[PDB]
Amino acid sequence: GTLGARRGLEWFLGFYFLSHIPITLLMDLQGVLPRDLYPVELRNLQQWYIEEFKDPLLQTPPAWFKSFLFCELVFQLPFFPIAAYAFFKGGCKWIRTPAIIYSVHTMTTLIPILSTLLLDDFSKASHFRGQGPKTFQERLFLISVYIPYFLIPLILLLFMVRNPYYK
Amino acid sequence: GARRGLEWFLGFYFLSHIPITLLMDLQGVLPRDLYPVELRNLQQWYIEEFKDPLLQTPPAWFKSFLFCELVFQLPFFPIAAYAFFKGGCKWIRTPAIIYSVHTMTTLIPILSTLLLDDFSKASHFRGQGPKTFQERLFLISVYIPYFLIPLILLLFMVRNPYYK
Ligand SMILES: CC(C)CCC[C@@H](C)[C@H]1CC[C@H]2[C@@H]3CC=C4C[C@@H](O)CC[C@]4(C)[C@H]3CC[C@]12C
Ligand SMILES: CCCCCCCC/C=C\CCCCCCCC(=O)OC[C@H](O)CO
Ligand SMILES: C1=C(c2c[nH]c3ncccc23)CCN(CCCc2ccccc2)C1
Ligand SMILES: C1=C(c2c[nH]c3ncccc23)CCN(CCCc2ccccc2)C1
């Protein structure tokens, strides 16, 4: 019938947050959670992503990146079902301030991630021991997996600051 | 007035942040020749006294945060100082929430590294940084207020009745 732009974005936000739950549990937190909570097929799927996409941070996370991973588990993950509910339902003014908090937190998390992937040395002679992108194409093929987690928080932040239906 | 007392404190927090950012925090991002020799020696006194391994030669993740301090945070500092020094500025709430969560998120990995990383002959930091746990507390002593004060500002904006 009639699907408006506001309501389409809210459905999009619901699927972003519903999809983030398995992504966080089964892939992102492989570097902090014990391996034995994962079946071998899921651990080898984890290995496939790291080999194909040349990811230097997820499997063996540095301290700065490991601190963001514990924020994902302890702060972001409980919020994902609540935000999925609110944006699927659509009329929830009580999601404004928590969504802005999430959006700023996640955009700030991803600035150093994207800068490290674009600018740092991931060679054998580095501490990443060659498990990172070497070519400019390998850097941008990996950034492509992280960039929606900056941009979609950026869209959510703009939506929540200006939408009269949430203030 | 306890509400006004916090606003005066927050006002002096944002005012003092301006020189702290320009003359000290951005030594690794901005060029050496911009700074006079007396300011460069003062920066060296901080680095050596507090054994700071990040500020002078910033890693890429910390450097990205420093650029956020120059481009986003520093333009906000005078506007926030005015708002809280004057009071009655409900329009600062959503900006101050954004500033606070951004700076809290910035400080979590910094504080984590300073407290949980081995700086003892780690080729990562060229033999610099805190070695004992007391040296770690001494360094964190200058970073912790820039997490706790933003945390106070967040609760202030989210819960205080004037700022919704
Ligand atoms: C005299 C020595 C010690 C310090 C020199 C300070 C210089 C480098 C400072 C003073 C004011 C600063 C500017 C203040 C505000 C902004 C807006 C921001 O969006 C980009 C950076 C920019 C444009 C800053 C660039 C650096 C700057 C020009
Ligand atoms: C308060 C903040 C902390 C709590 C936040 C919520 C924590 C979520 C809990 C568990 C998820 C664990 C994920 C591991 C899933 C592994 C898959 C698995 O076990 O598969 C089953 C089996 O192999 C089939 O036969
Ligand atoms: C880190 C992410 C992340 C989001 N928010 C965070 N906050 C703090 C810390 C990290 C994050 C999200 C993206 N994720 C990559 C998933 C790669 C993948 C997806 C699907 C199937 C297989 C493999 C790495
Ligand atoms: C980094 C800081 C910081 C605050 N916000 C940020 N956002 C993003 C990135 C960094 C920061 C503030 C503290 N500062 C140390 C000043 C030590 C000092 C102060 C005064 C005189 C001499 C020496 C290091």
Swiss-Prot record, chain B:
**Binding residue positions for cholesterol:** V71, Q73
Per the record, the major location class is endoplasmic reticulum
- Name the Gene Ontology molecular function terms of this record: cholesterol binding; oxysterol binding
Signal sequence residues? none
Q: Where in the cell is it found?
A: Rough endoplasmic reticulum membrane; Nucleus membrane
Q: Which GO terms describe its biological process?
A: cholesterol homeostasis; positive regulation of lipoprotein transport; positive regulation of wound healing; regulation of intracellular cholesterol transport; regulation of intracellular lipid transport
Q: Which UniProt keywords apply?
A: Endoplasmic reticulum, Membrane, Nucleus, Transmembrane, Transmembrane helix
Q: Which residue ranges does the entry give as Lumenal-facing topology? A: 27-64, 117-137
In what way does this protein cross or attach to the membrane? Multi-pass membrane protein
Membrane topology, Cytoplasmic segments:
86-95
By its UniProt entry, which PROSITE patterns does this protein fall under? Answer: EXPERA
Which residues are in the EXPERA domain?
Answer: 6-154
Site annotation Important for 20(S)-OHC binding and stereoselectivity: residues: Y146
Q: Which domain of life is it from?
A: Eukaryota
| One GO cellular component term | plasma membrane
Give the Pfam families listed for this entry: EBP
Please give the family membership noted in the entry.
Belongs to the TMEM97/sigma-2 receptor family.
Subunit composition and interactions: Homodimer. Interacts with NPC1; the interaction impairs NPC1-mediated cholesterol transport. Interacts with PGRMC1 and LDLR; the interaction increases LDL internalization. Interacts with histatin 1/HTN1; the interaction induces HTN1-stimulating wound healing. Interacts with TSPO.
How does the record comment on the protein's domains? The EXPERA domain doesn't possess any sterol isomerase catalytic activity.
Other facts noted in the record for this chain: Sigma receptors are classified into two subtypes (Sigma-1 and Sigma-2) based on their different pharmacological profile. Sigma-2 receptors are identified by radioligand-binding studies as a binding site with high affinity for di-o-tolylguanidine (DTG) and haloperidol.
Q: What does this protein do?
A: Sigma-2 receptor which contributes to ameliorate dysfunctional cellular processes and slow degenerative progression by regulating cell functions including cholesterol biosynthesis/trafficking, membrane trafficking, autophagy, lipid membrane-bound protein trafficking, and receptor stabilization at the cell surface. Forms a ternary complex with PGRMC1 receptor and low density lipoprotein receptor/LDLR at the plasma membrane, which increases LDLR-mediated LDL cholesterol internalization.
Q: What name appears for this protein in its UniProt entry? A: Sigma intracellular receptor 2
Q: Which organism is it from?
A: Bos taurus (Bovine)
The gene from which this protein is expressed is TMEM97
